[PDB]
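tool_call predict_complex ligand=zinc ion
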Amino acid sequence: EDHLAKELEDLNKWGLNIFNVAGYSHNRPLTCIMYAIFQERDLLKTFRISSDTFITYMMTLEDHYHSDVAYHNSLHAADVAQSTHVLLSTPALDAVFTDLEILAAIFAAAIHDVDHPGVSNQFLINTNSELALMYNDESVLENHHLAVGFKLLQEEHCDIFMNLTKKQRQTLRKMVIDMVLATDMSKHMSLLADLKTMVETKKVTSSGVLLLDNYTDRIQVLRNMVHCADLSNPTKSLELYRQWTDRIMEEFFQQGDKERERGMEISPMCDKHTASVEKSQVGFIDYIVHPLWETWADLVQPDAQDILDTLEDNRNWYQSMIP
Ligand SMILES: Nc1ncnc2c1ncn2[C@@H]1O[C@H](COP(=O)(O)O)[C@@H](O)[C@H]1O
Ligand SMILES: [Mg+2]
Ligand SMILES: [Zn+2]
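tool_result ok
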């Protein structure tokens, strides 16, 4: 309608408000934004992806995210895809990525938490869940998110990559898997350390554009870009960041309830009777989000200085909300 179109004017911008697009799209944010992103990039024409086939795949995919989960629903997927779309345009990365790589990073973002149950890998591992048994306690949710996303591409009416070459399907699949598995927070530190090393040896053209030699370097940046997009909520406007905070805290607190019922040890940050929503965000920004975005800012300087200023401002707002 007229409201959705106005909101989509900010499709290529960090200030896009995904909750508004959700309200104006019959509550199908992921389908909406994926279609918008794909048209915007000429990806359908480039990969001969049929419009019908693409829409059907996206609606089914959206349907497999759970609507009764506070945070890990289709809104978050849609947020990570849209933010990955903006990050792919950073001036410092101009013309560095093939269209297959661009295609893989946005697809990875869309499917990256599909069928999320609203509990963490640790919880699934400690309750001897079927998912943890299937996956041997290693990146349990992430392996599953990839398995569901690639499973939906198997049926004929839903295979959006059919017109890619065999070689292209193969290379995309390797990159996608790499990206979703990189969203597993137990790998954050190794990822952050490896990204710092890549900044140290950073090489550019006269145009202030990054020089990535081989595949290894390009996928290292995409891995990190998707991970930053996933941990991007504290970098968005404060009003958006606070909506995301309430949604994740709700999900974490419902996990502390499930744990207390089962008589398990309550995880302190998931404990609604003891944890501060305000301290949780400061600690999250100081030890995880800032160190990551600071390093990303260095890689693409000064393209992300605004995001970093906003992050610092949001961190200080949460700090002031602690007495
Ligand atoms: N606002 C937040 N406060 C605390 N932790 C967060 C917040 N946003 C993201 N995270 C963490 O980052 C992870 C990202 O992975 P995922 O939850 O699977 O989307 C979450 O599981 C949280 O542990
Ligand atoms: Mg995840
Ligand atoms: Zn996520």
